[PDB]
Amino acid sequence: DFYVSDGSKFISQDFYPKFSWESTPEYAMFGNGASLLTPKEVEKIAAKTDFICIEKNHAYRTLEFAEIGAREEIKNFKAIKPEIKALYYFNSAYAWPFTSYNKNFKKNKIDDYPELKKFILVDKTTGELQHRNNTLCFDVLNPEFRTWWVKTVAQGVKDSGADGVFIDQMHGFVWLRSSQKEEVEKAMGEMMANLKAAIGTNKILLGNNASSVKDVFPAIDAAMFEHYNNKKLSKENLLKEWGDMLANAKAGKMSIFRIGVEAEKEEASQTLIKGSRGESLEELSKERLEYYQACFLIGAQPYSYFQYGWGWRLDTGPLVDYPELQKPLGAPKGAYKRLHENGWEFTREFEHASVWVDTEKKEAKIEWK
Template identity: 35%
Template sequence: MRLILALSVVLALSVQALHAAGADGHPPFSWGTVPVYAHLANMSEDFTSEQHDFLAEHFDFITIEKGHAKRNRGSTEKGFAIAVQEIKKRNPKAKVLFYWNSTIKIGGYEAIDDFPKGGELVSKDGEPMTIFSCPFCDLSQKEVQDWWADTASVAVRECGADGIFIDAVGKFSINSRRKVLTPEKIEALNDGMVAMVKDTRGKVGPSKLLIQNGVSIDPENIGDRLLKVTDGAMKEHFVSAQPGNKEQLAESIEMLQEVGKSGKVLVIKTWPGFDWRNKEIMKKPREERAKMAREAITFPLACYLIVAEPYSYFCYTWGYQGNDTGTFEWYPELDKPLGPPQGDAKRDGWKYTREFAHASVYVDIETGESKIDWRE
């Protein structure tokens, strides 16, 4: 029995070392400091040399968003390829993902020229379905599934992507779609998405990352179905500077703990209490927004630390597009020694605590009170 236990420990440590080195396609991971993730793009132009330096120095795990540098490079694919090349020149171990929306036909990609004729989704009344003036893709059609998977494969094979960030996986099942699509059509669309992602896995290979935006442990939910195929997920709206609905947050904490323990990669996206849609705040100088974010970071970071497992990454910005939505800010907490967790988080009502080698974490998701005591 002791021999079996010892072998199990050695195997677990070997697998963790393999992941840490990124040898199996996983992003590098370490508890040395808070593990972080970047998600951004600049539609107008390439990142500057200084911005490439910053990304390469601070992040080993990055998604380049839709539309990057398309205005001066002509397409997202060209802009993405240059960004990957520049980042990897500076940080060869970095894993950089290609953003590819699973549901919406977004412009700015060369691949749009090959979109299948008649592949756009229509409602049960025959009306074109759009969001933000972009058509939905009819994923019940095999030709559309093939087009999507082939584009993902090209991004990996020709543009240098280490994998695909699969956005908008739950868009077909929300209430507004249920009003204009039959239950049978929604089921066919979701089945088509699962088939499409499985096909993509085969085309990009097992060592490339597939990260979905949307996470669930409900077997009836498309997020849970896809998680059996993908390597992990982003939880895009985990917490902001204030707790919000404590019951929902407690459910999210429990879910993320379960998914993290399963070995999946998790991106925990948090917010400083505002985002790019707040026009008044976005009119303020960048330095003022950065100050607000610095003052608000403790609660989001503490909530992340409560749920973090190996290959869980912290993301803290107020947007994705442009140079002043938070990615190029940095925070003293992210340089402090952290060390591995000394066990799971403990819950007492709405209060959570957790110990790390160099930090003690406390958070009350009812009041928003939070504290991280850092130790050398």
């Protein structure tokens, strides 16, 4: 059903990804800086999802540039599953130097490209470029950067053949110029609208954490809830996000409800390193799947999708067998119910499942029919 949880109907556009309530709708987003996906790995992802996104550095160590890695996976996935949608990635804020477009944003090259260096925020006290681990910061207030950036994102979508682009970061480093908050907010909304215009009319623009970003919302076809800290996972914020998923639905937009269990900062993953940390995170994702699956299902709308794992890499979720995500679900039988008044237990029913979740005590049961 295209029915929204308030009885209104969803009106998809022709260029949206495939959607069905047959099992839990899934979005996969991943990269491996080391290499491209093997034959069998493309098959595993493709049988899991009709809607995927290639990450910021994919295969750039072996194909030189991340948009080439993207291009390889668009080709590979479209070959086996023609109806799949594959999104490119680009950050509006951090000048990650993994594409050809951003290759000069490093300490060794940037002084050789003064025209690109003027796009970056400078520390006023030292006169040095601001950075985070030597990754530089775009300045959305600079109109010349915004023009470059839109043209640059369009280039990467066109070269990779992707069906759209995931745009990461909405904040424009407002904390570095908080007196100019309203200007930054407006400038980022203007960037995103100009990008939507420059992109082909069949391209999906996904704004990360943009569902409530007032100036960016009108530009995007899709938004992600990234759940990157415990505040985003709080019982109060989840309640709000189910409301935001409804509003996204009513506006004709797609929602990605993303959970990575590394954001829990659980105690089991305390002082662990390398593969031992990955083993613990995998085992936590398995133990937590029913809870987080239930959290998505309480707010799920048409053209909303679930992404699960413990990171952003090929090896942190996309290749993991979560059999509950393959169980028959069916169309929701209306909107979730708040069990109580003031309590944090919520239920909802689907054709082939019953869902209960307690977002205070962090418990769930999905009864499969």
